[PDB]
Amino acid sequence: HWGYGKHNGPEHWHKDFPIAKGERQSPVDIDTHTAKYDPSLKPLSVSYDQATSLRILNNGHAFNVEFDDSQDKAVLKGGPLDGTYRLIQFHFHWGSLDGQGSEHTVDKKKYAAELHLVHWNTKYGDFGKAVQQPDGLAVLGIFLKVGSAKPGLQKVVDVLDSIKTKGKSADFTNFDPRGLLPESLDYWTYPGSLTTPPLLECVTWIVLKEPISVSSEQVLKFRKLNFNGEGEPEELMVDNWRPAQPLKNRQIKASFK
Ligand SMILES: NS(=O)(=O)Nc1ccc(S(N)(=O)=O)cc1
Numbered sequence: 662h663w664g665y666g667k668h669n670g671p672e673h674w675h676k677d678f679p680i681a682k683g684e685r686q687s688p689v690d691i692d693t694h695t696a697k698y699d700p701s702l703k704p705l706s707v708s709y710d711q712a713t714s715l716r717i718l719n720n721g722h723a724f725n726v727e728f729d730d731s732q733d734k735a736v737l738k739g740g741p742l743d744g745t746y747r748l749i750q751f752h753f754h755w756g757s758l759d760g761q762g763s764e765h766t767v768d769k770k771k772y773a774a775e776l777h778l779v780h781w782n783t784k785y786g787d788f789g790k791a792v793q794q795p796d797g798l799a800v801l802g803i804f805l806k807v808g809s810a811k812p813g814l815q816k817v818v819d820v821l822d823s824i825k826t827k828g829k830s831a832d833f834t835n836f837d838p839r840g841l842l843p844e845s846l847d848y849w850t851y852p853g854s855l856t857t858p859p860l861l862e863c864v865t866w867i868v869l870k871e872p873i874s875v876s877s878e879q880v881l882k883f884r885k886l887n888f889n890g891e892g893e894p895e896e897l898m899v900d901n902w903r904p905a906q907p908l909k910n911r912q913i914k915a916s917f918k
């Protein structure tokens with residue numbers, strides 16, 4: 662069905678998911694000069710010391726590293742968030758070339774890729790119930806640029822050959838997501854949505870200002886994945902990003918001055 666091709670890409674999504682033209686859609690361009698420092702923001706807290714990864718899956722749109730979220734582990738709190746949000750999975754969006762790939766942009770600049778660490782508000786019980794609330798999710802977005810290799814990303818890169826096609830999964834335990842974070846937690850935040858259908862508007866976006874560096878070799882392996890399932894014509898999993906959407910009645914807040 663929906664995808665990133667000419668006949669099922671972002672421009673077509675609204676037909677089956679009308680919210681695609683909603684009032685708080687993501688991603689968006691982050692105009693750094695218009696963004697305003699917000700003193701009401703509390704310190705951001707990323708506590709992944711107890712994170713328990715379980716599996717990695719090629720879902721035909723990207724690959725998800727899934728976590729066991731049945732217990733109070735790997736949580737995000739503070740910042741613009743009220744309460745605790747639990748990590749359920751992370752994935753990336755990337756391009757066919759280093760010059761594009763990210764969903765959010767900074768002053769219209771597109772990064773090579775973008776990491777999304779997905780969390781759900783614990784007050785709602787689980788992910789399913791959370792996506793029915795305006796503040797059900799919190800996604801920590803991190804930009805990727807091509808340069809030095811990111812050591813903490815290699816284990817992910819080396820398992821991709823086992824989940825080349827749609828529907829394939831593989832055991833992926835003991836992966837520490839702390840190895841994917843930049844040094845600084847400075848960020849921009851705004852109310853948005855999921856960037857892929859169903860495009861639900863339940864996300865508080867927290868996009869870090871400092872990008873992490875990954876090597877050309879690492880991202881090239883991302884590009885070897887397939888959108889298609891085994892035995893079908895090969896279509897490389899590249900450019901699986903949605904372009905910036907209208908900001909509409911929203912303001913982007915900065916955690917730094
Ligand atoms: N969300 S959407 O992009 O409109 N969904 C969609 C778009 C195109 C087709 S198809 N394969 O052309 O019939 C099927 C589903």
Ligand SMILES: NS(=O)(=O)Nc1ccc(S(N)(=O)=O)cc1
Nearest residue numbers: 725727728729730731749750788
């Ligand atoms: N809830 S869990 O079984 O521990 N883990 C889990 C992790 C990820 C997803 S999903 N399908 O990515 O939303 C669903 C469940």
Ligand SMILES: NS(=O)(=O)Nc1ccc(S(N)(=O)=O)cc1
Nearest residue numbers: 777779800854855856857858859
């Ligand atoms: N695929 S889903 O079950 O709706 N969950 C989901 C989770 C996160 C995002 S995103 N790209 O981080 O906005 C999009 C969809």
Ligand SMILES: [Zn+2]
Nearest residue numbers: 752754777856
């Ligand atoms: Zn995403």
